[PDB]
Design a protein around this nucleic acid. Structure first.
Ligand SMILES: [Zn+2]
Lengths: 50, 123, 54, 90, 70, 101
RNA sequence: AAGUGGCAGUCACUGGUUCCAAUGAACAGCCUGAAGGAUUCCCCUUGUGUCCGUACUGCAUCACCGCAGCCGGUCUCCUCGACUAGACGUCGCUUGUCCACGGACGAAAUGCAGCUAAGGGAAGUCGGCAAACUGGCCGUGCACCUUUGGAAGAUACGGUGGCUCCAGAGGCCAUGGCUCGUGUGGAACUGUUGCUGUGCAGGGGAAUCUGACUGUUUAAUUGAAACCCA
RNA sequence: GGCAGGAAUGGCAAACAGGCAAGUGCGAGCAAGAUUCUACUGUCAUGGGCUGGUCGGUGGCGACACCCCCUCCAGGCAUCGAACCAGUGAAUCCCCUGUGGAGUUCUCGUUUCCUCCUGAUGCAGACUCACGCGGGCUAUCGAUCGGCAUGACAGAUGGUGGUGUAUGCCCUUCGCUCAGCAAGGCGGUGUGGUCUCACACCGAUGG
RNA sequence: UGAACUAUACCGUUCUACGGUGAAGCCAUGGGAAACUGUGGUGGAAGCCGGUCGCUGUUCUGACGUGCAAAUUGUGUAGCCUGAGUGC
């Protein structure tokens, strides 16, 4: 709902920011780097505890 | 979604609802290039979007039936589902009878038509 | 953590413009957004062409 | 018309709880509901507010006595004994 | 908002530093002057058809006299 | 004694309701104007005449204007001209026969 | 000059009335009084109003929980028209929606659901299980037994449409104008005897055992004669 | 620092209870926020600066009414269950007459449908004998006068003062009139170029 | 560690159509020497009845039983629904 705490809102915003796919230029980093973002949540799949 | 945004904006601007909004089928292109409430206003001014007149729930049947029922036509024992007290309560009948009779007695008492002893008698 | 008063003074110091009012959001991500309504004598467009918003 | 024979105010209980218990509660509830005599203003106006509290709607008095009746019998005898004891040790 | 009792109250309200503008509504039934002081709008309703003109003249020239009527 | 007008100038200029569809309309009215809920009882109560390209209903009695709108719509329907013409109130005591835009 | 078209349910307030061996918060804040005391004589970050929540969902057929986009569950508010006693039930304006994997073939057998069925009427079966009968309202009327309260809607009998009338209650302006019983009774005519015409809507009676009653109960095999009660 | 007061530690805890104050255009204009922005119209709480003569005064028979700080104590509001009955008001809903637009018209139908609206706020008004909605109190009079009466659906009252009467007095829910306010909204009828849109006109402020 | 399901206590708070029936109290009235009593109304009580929401869960020992569901389901059938009621 609309009612939140400032702490909860900051945490939800950080989770929104983390919910992002890897930059494209990252795989090319010489020593073989990450291909995809394995830490990526979706509101349907997995819920935040909070 | 082809014209969903335009239908929603038009419902808002017309104060009806998207199920009373009429989008011109021969102007679907210009309607789809709307993109804003201002352009939906332009389209509404131009006639490519209309507020359909509310459908009819005519009352002429009920009105004729009500005239006849007041004449006493469809009120017989075969049309009554609720008890007499549920149709017309004996309590409200008594209440309005008492008020009518007390108003009459009190009008007669104010005039020199009855004594106050006769008033209390009849009350 | 900027107050509306802090934002008023900071705005008047960065760009010497009197703020008629300040309203503030904390936008979802966690940034704090501020609308700064200028006095009628001021012109947000004439200020934006300085600031670089164009 | 007369609506009951033996049952009185206990018509609310209908058929339940037993005749000999409805008898006692009738004797009690008639008094609990009735207006009692005010020995102050001289009007039958004491209404039972709560258990033991009786308010007079005319005089405005508020008295403590009796769960179901304004004055218990022990109260009426206690008044007399206390009066006579005070009379003698004046 | 508040109504004005008569034209002398209207004029003493118009003669205040905090008054800024008089709106003039030209109705079929009447004509009314809406003085915008701060915290209140003072409306003077007059039904006469040339008393209104003389009152619009009475209005001092330092006040913005916005005529509304459509 | 009120006056009412039905303005047929717009059609009469284009030769659709011009010559004697107007007089047929007048006779339609003389037939169907109802006074106290009866027809033929419009003598000394309602007089229908024609000021050329516009019909004129003079009413000695309490008469309605939406009633005239009803009856002109009925005449337009009976003459099939309603697909092309609209009755529009341009002035009190006046209706007009216009085209659709 | 300065309530009033109508009346239905809802809400608010008002005046009350009943119920309790039940009498149905506190605090901040605010006000009045009583008694004392004392008594120099328009303008200002458009004064201040800072801080945080503010999207959308939310009885969800996809936004939550149930491993899921699960016929389950989940808090409150508003709530139209017609029939009707109606927040039942049936249909409709406003709002919203046509989304649930579909298509052909009259579409086997079997099944899960809806119905019918002659003659008989429990002969079926552990057992009338399942279904059926009855069903609303009005009038007349109602037995045993009883804790005198009930039993009881006992059981039962008659009617119910449509139309045209006849009676029948009130109010306002001033015994006339207007409003005026969808609320009742009677009669005449009428119909292939049929009318609570649809949805809805008790089958009834007579005993034995048992618990007095009402209430409670093993969430997910037992609702009981068990527990509780006075 | 002196004097005079001053029993009884500091908090947490309700997004349903207590608890200051905002309404309309739901728009200027949003793709997405809005009692938050916007245009109007308001409301609330609180701070600072400035300018020999002192128990605020008066009217009413009364209920009461009007104009011109400090201490302590006594009260009260906040403030409280449920159900039922009656009344009034609101919005909804419906009806009558009329208007504006629309649907039907094979026949009938002065027909059918929509609309005809009004918020907070005001130290504005008329009543308040609620002469629309009702309780309380005041003054006068003094009842059952021998048949007690008044008022209620029901209560309920009355020599502990009924009925009647009046400058009657008070509070409150409203409702009504005005300002807000018609400029807005609603149903339309048009003009102008058109454009990255303003003007004109009409239509119940009905019972 | 857990009282988010669930049991119970407290604090605050919410919800409860439409009918039937007709307790006390009251009004008129008939009878009686009186004590008492007949009738017609009014009134609207009850851990009262039917019944909606709702809650519960009888019966079909129906459906399903690789389900919609690790307990649900019926265009059924039932219990209660002003109270020892109900939820948050
Ligand atoms: Zn007393």
């Amino acid at each position: 709902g609309a009612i939140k705490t400032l702490k909860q809102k900051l945490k939800y915003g950080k989770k929104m920011k983390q919910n992002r796919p890897i930059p494209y230029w990252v795989r090319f980093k010489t020593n073989s780097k990450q291909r995809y973002n394995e830490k990526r949540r979706h509101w349907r799949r997995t819920k935040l505890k909070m | 979604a082809g014209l969903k945004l335009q239908g929603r904006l038009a419902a808002a601007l017309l104060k009806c609802g998207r199920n009373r909004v009429w989008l011109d089928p021969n102007e679907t292109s210009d309607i789809a290039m709307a993109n804003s409430r201002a352009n939906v206003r332009k389209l509404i001014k131009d006639g490519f979007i209309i507020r359909k007149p509310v459908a009819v729930q005519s009352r002429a049947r009920w009105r004729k039936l009500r005239a006849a029922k007041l004449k006493g036509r469809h009120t017989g024992p075969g049309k009554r589902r609720g008890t007499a007290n549920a149709r017309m309560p004996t309590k409200v009948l008594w209440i309005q009878r008492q008020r009518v009779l007390r108003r009459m007695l009190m009008r007669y008492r104010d005039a020199k038509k009855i004594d106050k002893h006769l008033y209390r008698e009849l009350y | 953590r900027a107050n509306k008063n802090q934002i008023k003074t900071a705005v008047r110091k960065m760009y010497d413009i009197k703020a008629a009012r300040v309203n503030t959001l904390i936008r979802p991500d966690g940034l704090k957004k501020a609308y700064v309504k200028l006095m009628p004598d001021n012109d947000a467009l004439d200020i934006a062409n300085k600031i670089g918003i164009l | 018309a007369r609506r009951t024979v033996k049952v009185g105010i206990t018509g609310k209980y209908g058929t339940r709880y037993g005749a000999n218990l409805r008898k006692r509660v009738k004797k009690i509830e008639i008094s609990k509901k009735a207006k009692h005599f005010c020995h102050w203003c001289g009007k039958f106006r004491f209404k039972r507010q709560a258990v033991g509290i009786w308010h007079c709607t005319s005089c405005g008095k508020t008295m403590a006595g009796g769960a179901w009746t304004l004055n218990t019998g022990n109260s009426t005898t206690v008044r007399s004994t206390i009066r006579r004891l005070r009379e003698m040790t004046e | 908002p508040k109504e004005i009792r008569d034209i002398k109250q209207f004029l003493v309200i118009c003669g205040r530093k905090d008054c800024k503008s008089v709106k003039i509504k030209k109705n079929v039934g009447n004509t009314k002057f809406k003085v915008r002081t701060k915290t209140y709008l003072y409306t003077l309703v007059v039904k006469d058809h040339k008393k209104s003109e003389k009152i619009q003249q009475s209005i001092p020239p330092n006040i913005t006299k916005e005529v509304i009527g459509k | 004694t009120i006056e009412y007008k039905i303005d047929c100038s717009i059609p009469a200029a284009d030769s659709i309701f011009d010559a004697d569809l107007l007089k047929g309309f007048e006779q339609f009215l003389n037939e169907r104007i109802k006074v106290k809920g009866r027809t033929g009882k419009l003598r000394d109560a309602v007089k229908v005449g024609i000021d050329g390209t516009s019909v004129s209903i003079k009413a000695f009695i309490a008469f309605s204007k939406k009633y005239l709108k009803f009856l002109t719509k009925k005449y337009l329907k009976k003459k099939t001209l309603r697909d092309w013409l609209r009755v529009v109130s341009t002035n009190k005591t006046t209706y007009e026969l216009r085209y659709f835009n």
